[PDB]
C-alpha cells in the first residue's frame, strides 16, 4: 500500500508579537461535540485558538507572562480529576512550570526546581495529575500536580550527561523513553514497585498534616540505555507501540527497538547491549536543533515540519516507511521553519507553527 491522506490549507495567520512560535498542542481532553481548541507557545506568550467551520482560526485568549524575558518552548494539556476543569502546563527558558487555567487564561500555580530551561512537558496517559518535565539541567522530573509534589528526579551517574531534549510515555503509561544532546536514549520504567509506591505516597502528602517535606525518589539508573542509534543530538522521541521513533540531524525519523529483532520490550534488561534499526521515514532540510514530529491520537499519521516551511506527513499503516509518504503540505507564503505540528483528536485538522510567528491550518479530505 501507499498513503492516500490529503489535506488542504484552509487558513493562516501571524501572531502580532512577531516572535518565533516554538510549540503547539490541540486539547485532546475536549469532549465530542465541543469546539476544537489549540494552544500556541512562543516568547512570554501562551495563546488559545478555536478552529471553526469555513477554516476560521478564532483567537480565544492571550496569556502574557509578567516576566518579559521568559521564552516558552512547550505546552501540554490536562484536566483537574476532581472538577473536570481543563488545565494547560507551559514551560521554557526560565525552567519554571506554569499551570494556566485556560478559561480565565490566568496562571494558577508554578513549579520551581529544575536548574535550567525546560524543553518538554508530557502528562501521563492515564493519570492527569502526573506531569513529566525534561530539562537542560540533564534531568527528568515527575510531578504530582494535584498534591504539588515532586515524585521523582531521573538523573545521576547513569542518567543523561547533557541537556535532555525530549521524552515520551508509552500508551499505557508504564514506561518513559527520553533522549539528549549527547545522542543517548534512555528507558525509565515507572510500573516498578518503587515508582508505584512513590506515586501513591505523593497522593497522600499534604503540607498541612506534617512539618516534614515530601521526599522525591532519586532514580540514578535507567532500565535501558543506548548511544548506538544516532551520531548527533536526538531532539524528538516518541513510542510507536513497543517501538521507538527518534530523530537527529540525518533528515530521517528512525524507527528502532532495544535488543535484537525478537526481543520483547518488557524482557529488556538494563545491561542490554543490542539495538535494532527497523526503518526510516525520510524527508529534506530539517537539520537545525528543536524540530519536533507528531502523531495523531490513533497513531495512523506522522507529521514533521522542516526548516523551509514544508510539512511532511506519513501513513503509519503502510509497513515500509520508505513507501509511507503522503503528499508534502506546502504553501508559497509558508517559508519559515515549522517548529511543531498538532493534529486535532479526530485527525480532521493539522496545525503548524513557525519561526516567523505564523500559524497554518490544514484540513484533511475524506
Amino acid at each position: 500500500k501507499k498513503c492516500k491522506y490529503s489535506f488542504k490549507c484552509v487558513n493562516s495567520l501571524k501572531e502580532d508579537h512577531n516572535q518565533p512560535l516554538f510549540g503547539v498542542q490541540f486539547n485532546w481532553h475536549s469532549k465530542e461535540g465541543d469546539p476544537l481548541v489549540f494552544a500556541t507557545v512562543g516568547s512570554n506568550r501562551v495563546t488559545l485558538y478555536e478552529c471553526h467551520s469555513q477554516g476560521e482560526i478564532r483567537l480565544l485568549q492571550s496569556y502574557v507572562d509578567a516576566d518579559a524575558d521568559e521564552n516558552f518552548y512547550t505546552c501540554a494539556w490536562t484536566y483537574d480529576s476532581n472538577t473536570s476543569h481543563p488545565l494547560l502546563a507551559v514551560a521554557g527558558s526560565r525552567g519554571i512550570i506554569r499551570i494556566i487555567n485556560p478559561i480565565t487564561m490566568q496562571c494558577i500555580k508554578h513549579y520551581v526546581g529544575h536548574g535550567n530551561a525546560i524543553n518538554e512537558l508530557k502528562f501521563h496517559p492515564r493519570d492527569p495529575n502526573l506531569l513529566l518535565s525534561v530539562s537542560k539541567d540533564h534531568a527528568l522530573r515527575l510531578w504530582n500536580i494535584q498534591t504539588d509534589t515532586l515524585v521523582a528526579i531521573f538523573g545521576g551517574v547513569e542518567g543523561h550527561r547533557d541537556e535532555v531534549l525530549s521524552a515520551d510515555y508509552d500508551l499505557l503509561g508504564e514506561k518513559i523513553m527520553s533522549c539528549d544532546m549527547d545522542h543517548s536514549l534512555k528507558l525509565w520504567r515507572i510500573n516498578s514497585k518503587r515508582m508505584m509506591n512513590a506515586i501513591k505516597e505523593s497522593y497522600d502528602y499534604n503540607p498541612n498534616k506534617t512539618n516534614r517535606p515530601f521526599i522525591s525518589q532519586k532514580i540514578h539508573f535507567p532500565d535501558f540505555s543506548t548511544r548506538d542509534i544516532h551520531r548527533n543530538y536526538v531532539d524528538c522521541v516518541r513510542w510507536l507501540g513497543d517501538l521507538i521513533l527518534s530523530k537527529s540531524c540525518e533528515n530521517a525519523i528512525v524507527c528502532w527497538k532495544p535488543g535484537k529483532m525478537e526481543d520483547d520490550i518488557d524482557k529488556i534488561k538494563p545491561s542490554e547491549s543490542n539495538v535494532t534499526i527497523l526503518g526510516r521515514f525520510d524527508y529534506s532540510q530539517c537539520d537545525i536543533w528543536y524540530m519536533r514530529f507528531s502523531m495523531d491520537f490513533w497513531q495512523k499519521m506522522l507529521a514533521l515540519g522542516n526548516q523551509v516551511g514544508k510539512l511532511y506527513v506519513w501513513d503509519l499503516e503502510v509497513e515500509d516507511p520508505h513507501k509511507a509518504k503522503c503528499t508534502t503540505l506546502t504553501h508559497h507564503k509558508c517559508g519559515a521553519a515549522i517548529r511543531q505540528t498538532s493534529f486535532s483528536r479526530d485527525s480532521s485538522i493539522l496545525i503548524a507553527v513557525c519561526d516567523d510567528a505564523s500559524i497554518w491550518r490544514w484540513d484533511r479530505l475524506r
Binding site: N27, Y79, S84, H85, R126, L240
Partner: peptide, 28 residues
C-alpha cells in the same frame, strides 16, 4: 513485527479512547 505492533497500538489506544469517552471535561 509491524502487524503485532499495530495490534498493540489498536488495543492500547482503544483503552485510552474508552477512558476518554467516560469523561466530561469542561470546554475552554
Amino acid at each position: 513485527m509491524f502487524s503485532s505492533n499495530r495490534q498493540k497500538i489498536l488495543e492500547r489506544t482503544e483503552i485510552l479512547n474508552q477512558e476518554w469517552k467516560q469523561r466530561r471535561i469542561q470546554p475552554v
